[PDB]
Ligand binder design. Structure first.
Ligand SMILES: CCOC(=O)CNC(=O)NCc1ccc(N)cc1
Length: 164
């Protein structure tokens, strides 16, 4: 079935808990596989140690720039960037997992977790999963954001991997 992956998150060195995500490999296999492999670190690089660098309350929490740590970087398991696979899944509400980008066909490693329905992103960002467990943790992360996206605490993915 669809992979389950996890992110363990700290804020200023204090554990916040675990976010568990279902990846919709049935709908977006290429996009799901990229994220899965970046969680396990099996290609020799991935999310472990990277930060949530841009968090905007009542919008989303963004992470996954493990090359530049500022939202300019990251890379996929296929190459620097890969195309938009499809726009079949929509940004239906809180807990949706979607790819960050710099315009059409610029998916890398950066991703975001929505804290509201972001319907205006439909057809622009590829949705590929959702939160199974740990929305309380996501709401904690959200609470350390600001209008500008700057975080008031350093929010680190201390561990990540695949559960099934
Ligand atoms: C709600 C999502 O907001 C964005 O995605 C705003 N864009 C964004 O931060 N773009 C920087 C970026 C650069 C390279 C890659 N691969 C991905 C993203």
């Amino acid at each position: 079935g669809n992979p389950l992956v996890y992110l363990d998150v700290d804020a200023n060195g204090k554990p916040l808990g675990r976010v568990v995500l279902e990846l919709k490999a049935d709908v977006v296999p290429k996009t799901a596989e990229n994220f899965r492999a970046l969680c396990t670190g099996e290609k020799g690089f991935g999310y472990k140690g990277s930060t949530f660098h841009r968090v905007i309350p009542s919008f989303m929490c963004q992470a996954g720039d493990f090359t530049n740590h500022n939202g300019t970087g990251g890379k996929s398991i296929y190459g620097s960037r890969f195309p938009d696979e499809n726009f079949t899944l929509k940004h239906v509400g809180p807990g949706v997992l979607s790819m960050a980008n710099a315009g059409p066909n610029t998916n890398g490693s950066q991703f975001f977790i929505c804290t509201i329905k972001t319907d205006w992103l439909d057809g622009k960002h590829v949705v590929f999963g959702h939160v199974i467990e740990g929305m309380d943790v996501v709401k904690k992360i959200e609470s350390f954001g600001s209008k500008s996206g700057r975080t008031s605490k350093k929010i680190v993915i201390t561990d990540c991997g695949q559960l099934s």
